[PDB]
Structures are given as C-alpha cells and as structure tokens.
Amino acid sequence: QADILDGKQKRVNLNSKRLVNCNQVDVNQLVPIKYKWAWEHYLNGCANNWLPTEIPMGKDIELWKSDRLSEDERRVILLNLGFFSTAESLVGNNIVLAIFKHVTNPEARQYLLRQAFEEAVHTHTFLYICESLGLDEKEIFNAYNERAAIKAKDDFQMEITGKVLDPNFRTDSVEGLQEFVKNLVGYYIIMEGIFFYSGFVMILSFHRQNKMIGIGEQYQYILRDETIHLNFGIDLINGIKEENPEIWTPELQQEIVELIKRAVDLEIEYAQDCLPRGILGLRASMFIDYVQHIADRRLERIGLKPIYHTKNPFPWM
Amino acid sequence: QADILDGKQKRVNLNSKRLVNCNQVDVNQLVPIKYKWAWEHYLNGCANNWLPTEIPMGKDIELWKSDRLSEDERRVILLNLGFFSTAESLVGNNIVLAIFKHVTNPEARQYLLRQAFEEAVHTHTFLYICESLGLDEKEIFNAYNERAAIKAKDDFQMEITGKVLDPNFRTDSVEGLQEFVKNLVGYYIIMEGIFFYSGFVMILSFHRQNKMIGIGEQYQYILRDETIHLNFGIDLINGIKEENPEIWTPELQQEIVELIKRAVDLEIEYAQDCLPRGILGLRASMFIDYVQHIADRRLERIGLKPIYHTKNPFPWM
C-alpha cells in the first residue's frame, strides 16, 4: 500500500488534461491518456522505423557519375538535397526548442519525441546521399546560405521561429497562444506540408522513371513519415482551437491565409529555380498548380476555405 | 553555382565548433562533424532499435496471476515498475527542456534526439507491462507520490532540474555552466547511472532464475540502451570540462561528490524498501555494496577518486 497516504489524491484526472497551459496537473505521468490520437500517431511512427543505409546507392552512384544524366536533371537533385539537408534540422530543432515546451501533455510529447528522432533520421539520409554520391557535403548543407530560392524559404520560416524562443515567451495570453499556433502552422502546414511535398514530387518523378532509385526509395520513406507528421500537426492545431476557441479570430484566420499565400509564392519561385526548362516531362507551370492545390487541401484541414481552386497535375501523389 | 556569393563565407569551420556557448557559428548545419563520439553513439543507438511489444508477456501473466510468487517477490516488481514508470519521463523531459537547448552542437543534438526517443520507448515498456499484468497503471505511475523511497529519489532529482529551466538561465557565465554540468551529472551519472542500475540488478535477478522473463527481457533491452546513455553523458561532461577548464574547480568537484554521496544514501534506502527480508538469495546488504561500488566507477569516469572502495557482489552485471 501507499506509505504516503496523501499521494493518492495526486492521481491525474482524465478531464483535467489539456494540450496547452495545463500546469495544474502532473504532466510527467503518461496515464490516463486523453489524446488517443497522439498515442496512435506515436505507435504508427514506431512501426515505420527505417535506416537510410539499408537502401543501396550503387546504381545511383553509377548513374550520377556517368554522362547519362543531363545538367538539368542534376540541378533538380542538387537543389533538393541542398534544401532538405538543413530543413530537417530546422524542423527537429523547432519541435524540441519551441513545440515540446508548450504542449503541456505527456502523450502528445511522446509523439513529439518520435517525430524529432525521425527528423534526425532524415538528416542522416541527406549526409548519406551526399557521401555516397561524392558530393561535397559542406557545400550541399550550406545551400541555404548560397542559393537565393532556398534562403528565401528558410528566412521566411525564421519569421515564425524567433518569437516562441524568447526567454519570456508564454502561451498563457491570447496573443501568446496565437503566436504559438502560427509557429505550428508554419512548421507543420507550411514547411512539412507544402515546402517538402513539392520537393517530393520532383524526386519521386525520377524514381517513377527508374532513375536515382536509391534516393527515390529514401524519399518514399521520408514521405511516409511526413504524412504522419502533418496529420499529427493538424490534430494538434485543431485540438488547441477546440480547447481555446477565443484564439481563432477572423484576424488570426486571415493572418494564417496570408502566411500560406506567401509560402505558395516562395515555393513556386523555388520550383522555377529547380526547373528552368523542364525534365522528365515536368514543367515549372505544373508546380504553380500543384503547390496551389495542396495549399488548398492544407487550408481545408484546419477549417479555412480553399483560395486557389487549382486541380492536381500529379494524381499519383 | 551559388547565386548568393557571400554565402560561401558561411560554411562552418570544424575548429570553431564547441559543445556549449557556441553561438558564433551556424549550429543547424550538421557538417563538418567535430564530435565523432556523438555520431557513433547515435549510430549505435539506432542499431539497438526494439519495441516492447515484440516481447511476449504470456508466461509472465500466468506466473504473476498464479500463487507461485511470494509477496516479497511481487513487491520488488511493483516498486521497480512504480519508480521506472515516471523516471523515464523525468529523464526524457530533461533532455529536451534542459540539455538540448544548451548543448550548442548539431551532432551531439542528433544523439540527444535518439536518447529522448529511447526514453519514450522505455515509458511505453512500463505501460505495456502494467496493462499486460492487469495492474492499475494509474496507481503504478503515481508511485512517485505514494511511496516515500521513490518520492525521495525524485524530489532529490528536482533539486538539479529546476535551475536550468528558469526563463533567464544561461550557460555563458562560470556559475551558469557549473549549474548545467551538475544537471548532467544528476541525470546521466546519478539517475541513469546509479538509480536505474540498482533496479536492473533486482529485475535481472528474476530473469536469471527464469521468472517473469518477459519483464526481464524488456529490462535487458533498457540496460543496453542505458549503457550508451551513460557513456554519451560521460563523454559530454568530460568534453565540456576539457573545453571550459575554469569550471572544474575543487568547489565543483566537491559538490559533485556530495551529490553522489547523497544519491547513494537514497538508493540504499530504496533497496531496503524493495527487500525488507530478501528474495532469490538477494539481501539488501548486497545493495549497500553494489550501489557503493558503481558510484565509485561513475566517479572515476569523470575524473574523481573512488570513496567507498567496496567490491561488486554481482559480477554478472
């Protein structure tokens, strides 16, 4: 039996748990779980475990070093490796330094720990593809300083990363929680849900034609993870809105649509840099449509109306 | 080629990387890796991947529900599940909320992301063992509020968890970095390296006698992970000391020995609570010796002299 009798009064009540600002209850005990969707995404992520180096790169190395790829095909590969190599760190660092501190719920934190480890796996994937192909990884990982279209995306991402890191930042004010929700939209909806999906189409287009299949297979594994990351983020944003409805004002709704519009513009500029002429039958115009179409699907999932209405040119995605 | 020419000046120099207070260099680019030991522990951890529920619990359930275990054997199981169920969260939360922010180095952060996900796997293990055995997990997870010997350990652990969480905490002062090193000693050397190893002996003693082998096999997997956690922590503490020698003063050295002495006292009290009479040929006196012996081995690894000199009564550990 208990030898500290008062301790029995401290067991956590299911109905007292909340996703943010929950400080009146012990957030170190996992049970009783309230947000079962977080536990399910955690189990699903654990089941998807993979390591990049189980995927062979020999065929990719022989093709990359041959004269069989055009300069335009190489450029698509190099720009995506440049963008993804540091963006995975940007996402993993934000989960840990910004999101976990403020999501005051153990089962959602359990999922965040799996998501941040998967982003570490994604970074390892890019080091492995650089070292396998013989690229100078110090140049590829610094692409966000050397290539304008990539720097513009990442500088935009910092516009929602800085506030939540301030030593005095708190979510126990309407404005503070709105700022935290914009960070979640920026990382889950925009970086993982729009910026990365655009690079997936480009790389998976090579894989579909039996080219650079080792890199293609790694991106298939990253997309399977990203699908759960986006789904968790959408559940967390909608769960926070439901529990704190006074933050979902027309002003915040419009600021979120403006952020997504800005992100679509930057991603179209990056697709143009990736495809100045076109490869594999892809043209940059197909991206103006695809990026706009997925932006609309992300707006719908968080309760906002589509704004572009464009059809999807890549049904296989 | 680069379309932002100045960006080439931003590539990271290997010699400018440091484990803490490194803010003059881009800490989002993984390369060039400097602390190869961190990358190696990260690869070794990834290779050790396991899920608790791949270990069958049927034989354990039948034994636990039979009248074949004594009350004294059940007490050892219940008290260890009570302590470990929330301590794994305490460790995972500290990695994320305290350690990662201040270890300003991407490859050490890559390892931290694997360690924090393994602590999430360890928490899942305890929920799974509770639900398999039919225990009321709300009682087991609240043991740190209901059982004095467990509460004393955890209240002690909070004595080095609180400072580093203050909004204004910084490591760019000698005192601030000393405080951060005491947090690392508290979690890696004391909680993972002394408190957990003592519970491992107790549980692995059942496994050696073919009892509760499903729980034993899970603890074998946790010990394999904990071995790397402790080794990484020892490398990180020694790396910080080497790079900031002015923090390793006789005053700090003596405060660390006093913390370890206090932890040994609390762990002996917990071993006595676990074994008021003795089971499986184990007696609590064997723990006074074992805890003292491992404390000495942890002191040696961070450059302090052994103080107890006791022999190890469990050579198989």
Ligand SMILES: [Fe+3]
């Ligand atoms: Fe990722």
Ligand SMILES: [Fe+3]
């Ligand atoms: Fe992601």
Ligand SMILES: [Fe+3]
């Ligand atoms: Fe653990």
Ligand SMILES: [Fe+3]
């Ligand atoms: Fe550990």
Ligand SMILES: [Pb+2]
């Ligand atoms: Pb622009």
Ligand SMILES: [Pb+2]
């Ligand atoms: Pb005492």
